[PDB]
Structure 1
């Protein structure tokens, strides 16, 4: 009684959707390195032997798309036809046009930076939970770390049969605690990872338990009842884009909170700061994390929304799950006094012209590496 299960998933750097997010952000970073004010909306599609870039970019940068794309794929680890994909020999197709002048005139042309309009309408959420130091759900943190461990053991040659495409899934049993949640145990773990033709299934399952799970998940969460689904399909030689077409912005729940909190639907990768799908979601995370680290709540959800061409948010809402002594009205007043959620101010607070976006495009955008949206603001009230 008073317990429940929750499941989250994550994917590796070579999962085809994640390849697309990383390439889209490599293109964004390449532009920002030369033109901090580049307007970028770069979608990527990946299928057998193909990376296609489709979208809209208006920028003063001179970017070599062939080189940027191939370097991103090389970093991921797809460097030979035996692995199903090779940066040296794949097709890179480009269908990029300028930003629509109708959007440009309605959003940013002849506007003071602080007063630029939102680049689109939409809704966005921020979330934070005190269950981990990084203020993230344990389910998603563990799922990301399992993928990172696979990449580590692939890159260091420990498990040379590993290939870049992987997925993980973690189910945790939680105890309810006055609106907050306390992890009790890991109920189920799934790991699927692309592999070479020579390794056998038993060798893989043993290595995934001993060298991956045990190296990531604290033993205190694992018990005799924990269920393991390791290589459950039985064979995963074909992988990457060859096994499944990838697209940018198809892992938006992996990118955020693993299903916890809420999501407004917008993808992050391949977009400059004027696209509030990314900047306002980062600012909302920053607000939520600041409320938790500031001791005002233990668990909190923030919604914001925008209209294209309008700078100020249309709506702001805060839900504290019963974990604050302050009302929603009081928390909203604190947020109003401490944050300015116009995109032209978020860009300054979070330094969103800096070319750090490729680093966000795998293992989640939140709870890692002290990015600006992860450094809480000291609140005055």
Structure 2
């Protein structure tokens, strides 16, 4: 009845995550001035370069140089010794207006509640009762290990740390009537960029004592747990210098760490009309509402859309055998309690608010009581 499952997370300075945070800093800058901004901002990062590419139609006047550099400063890349510096990097902009053909088919001359989906696509929401926040333990622990590295870097405890990091956690689970129960941590990987002076033994000792022990409960760690700490042996070159980053290349880290399912759409740099983000947030909200409402212990929700059409084309629910209700019954409850048109999701989840940069590291789900994390009281 036991099995292993692995998930990973990355830090704020991982190059792909830098791009997600910059794309959402650009989105938030537009929404601060124009709540109805149409934004599709992709970011690319390589040695010394941030490139913004995409489509924005907005009444805002945004200083992209300032917005980009402030996001990079927050992450911690502030000196050429670290491989990247917000003060002196190149910021290139290739942003055009939203295609008028998309605009006419999606939102022009449409009542807000009846706006079409901004694209076709499929999206999933997932929730599990294995943690209070209704997220898989593998991904929660992986995110917390990266957050702990950033905390110790920022407080000067481990001054050799740099912003680029990756973690990976394998947990041994027990199957429990469709639900899953974590038993123990089988393997942990941590790789983090570091300065030239610190030795490997000092880093491995600190990663075990100050990072892992400060995050993972001792009850999950035993004599058999395997640790791969700085497994490459050297990670001085990092950030965009070590690996090109792009927006929307960490979509599994952003969601459920491999659990549930994913429809392929990226979240960062997109306004509410792009259902890749708004409908995935709404599907998480539905899934978490079904679990917190006591209808299931674990659930997956799929929705899909066509560009220009407001109502979802399909809606499906899988409860893994953890509900006494059938899928037909759960779908009826969802129909009576939720309206998954993008023009209604925007109102329910307050999706014109400029809080998106806060979602772009450490996962979009299971944190900070964002609107999609506050369960809806269900009537049935």
TM-score range, shorter chain: over 0.9
Cα drift, residue 380 of structure 1: 0.1
Cα drift, residue 161 of structure 1: 0.1
Cα drift, residue 229 of structure 1: 0.1
Cα drift, residue 279 of structure 1: 0.0
Q: Deviations over 1:287-342 (max 9, x none)?
A: 00000000000000000000000000000000000000000000000000000000
Cα drift, residue 284 of structure 1: 0.0
Query: What SS does structure 1 have at the residue aligned with 2:269?
Result: coil
Q: Distance in 2 between matches of 1:44 and 1:159?
A: 30
| Corresponding residue of 1:154 | 153
Q: Distance in 2 between matches of 1:280 and 1:3?
A: 33
| Corresponding residue of 1:185 | 184
Runs of at least 5 residues in structure 1 that lack an aligned partner in the other structure: none
Q: Deviations over 1:190-235 (max 9, x none)?
A: 0000000000000000000000000000000000000000000000
Cα drift, residue 365 of structure 1: 0.0
Q: Distance in 2 between matches of 1:180 and 1:76?
A: 37
Q: Deviations over 1:45-84 (max 9, x none)?
A: 0000000000000000000000000000000000000000
Cα drift, residue 94 of structure 1: 0.1
Cα drift, residue 253 of structure 1: 0.1
Q: Distance in 1 between matches of 2:233 and 2:213?
A: 21
Query: What SS does structure 1 have at the residue aligned with 2:62?
Result: coil
Structure 2 residue 368 is matched with structure 1 residue 369: yes
Cα drift, residue 153 of structure 1: 0.1
RMSD: 0.1
Q: TM-score under structure 2 normalisation?
A: 1.00
Q: Distance in 1 between matches of 2:259 and 2:81?
A: 38
Aligned residue pairs: how many? 380
Query: What SS does structure 2 have at the residue aligned with 1:238?
Result: coil
Q: Deviations over 1:213-262 (max 9, x none)?
A: 00000000000000000000000000000000000000000000000000
| Corresponding residue of 1:250 | 249
Query: What SS does structure 2 have at the residue aligned with 1:44?
Result: strand
| Corresponding residue of 2:270 | 271
Cα drift, residue 264 of structure 1: 0.1
Q: Distance in 2 between matches of 1:155 and 1:302?
A: 38
Runs of at least 5 residues in structure 2 that lack an aligned partner in the other structure: none
Q: Which runs of 4+ in 1 moved over 3 A?
A: none
Cα drift, residue 186 of structure 1: 0.1
Q: TM-score under structure 1 normalisation?
A: 1.00
Query: What SS does structure 2 have at the residue aligned with 1:234?
Result: coil
